[PDB]
Amino acid sequence: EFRDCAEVFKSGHTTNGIYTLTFPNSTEEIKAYCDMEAGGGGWTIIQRREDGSVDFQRTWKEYKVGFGNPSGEYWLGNEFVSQLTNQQRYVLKIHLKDWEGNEAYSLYEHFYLSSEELNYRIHLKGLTGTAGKISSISQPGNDFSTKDGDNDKCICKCSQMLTGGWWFDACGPSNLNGMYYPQRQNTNKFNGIKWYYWKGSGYSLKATTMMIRPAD
Ligand SMILES: [Ca+2]
């Protein structure tokens, strides 16, 4: 059994693909995708967009246990990530693709989610990368919100206004779990897949991937 893609890569399995991981402090398993070829490898994907259209306006429960497929677009799960990220220090790497064929990334030295009781609040430290000098995810990390779980800092329900579950502020500078818009419909959409500090205002990205890995 493996705790994440890092241990998987370190056991000799150096090839990309879906792997079966096990929850820590539990016997439950979970199917995640391991990116072993992207620089160094050992990456555990926790979310992906590219479009295999999965529908991201999911419930609190669904974002907690995961939805979609590891082979395509998916969420992996908040309960698992929270358990992993509290067992040891993880790094978070977000890879983005726009519709003009450009790519970029944001990287955090340390990332972890608080337990469900604290609404899986995100914690971020030390940003680097080509996807902005200022974190597109509001610092002083927010709680996680879903259509049926409003934990943002807005008098409004950010989740329903922009669609998707996310660490919304007063609907901060980003939402990787927003409505997918195809080419030639990806501009001027407060509704799309946004990472403000890279493409800007109403730009809706073509593909996104969130992955974690420890300091290996
Ligand atoms: Ca609110």
Curated annotation (Swiss-Prot):
GO molecular function: metal ion binding; receptor ligand activity; receptor tyrosine kinase binding; signaling receptor binding
One Gene Ontology cellular component annotation held by this UniProt entry: collagen-containing extracellular matrix
Domain Fibrinogen C-terminal: 2-216
Function: Binds to TEK/TIE2, competing for the ANGPT1 binding site, and modulating ANGPT1 signaling. Can induce tyrosine phosphorylation of TEK/TIE2 in the absence of ANGPT1. In the absence of angiogenic inducers, such as VEGF, ANGPT2-mediated loosening of cell-matrix contacts may induce endothelial cell apoptosis with consequent vascular regression. In concert with VEGF, it may facilitate endothelial cell migration and proliferation, thus serving as a permissive angiogenic signal. Involved in the regulation of lymphangiogenesis.
Record's protein name: Angiopoietin-2
Location of this fragment in the whole protein: 281 to 495 of 496
Source organism: Homo sapiens
Description of its domains: The Fibrinogen C-terminal domain mediates interaction with the TEK/TIE2 receptor.
Gene from which this protein is expressed: ANGPT2
Cellular compartments annotated: Secreted
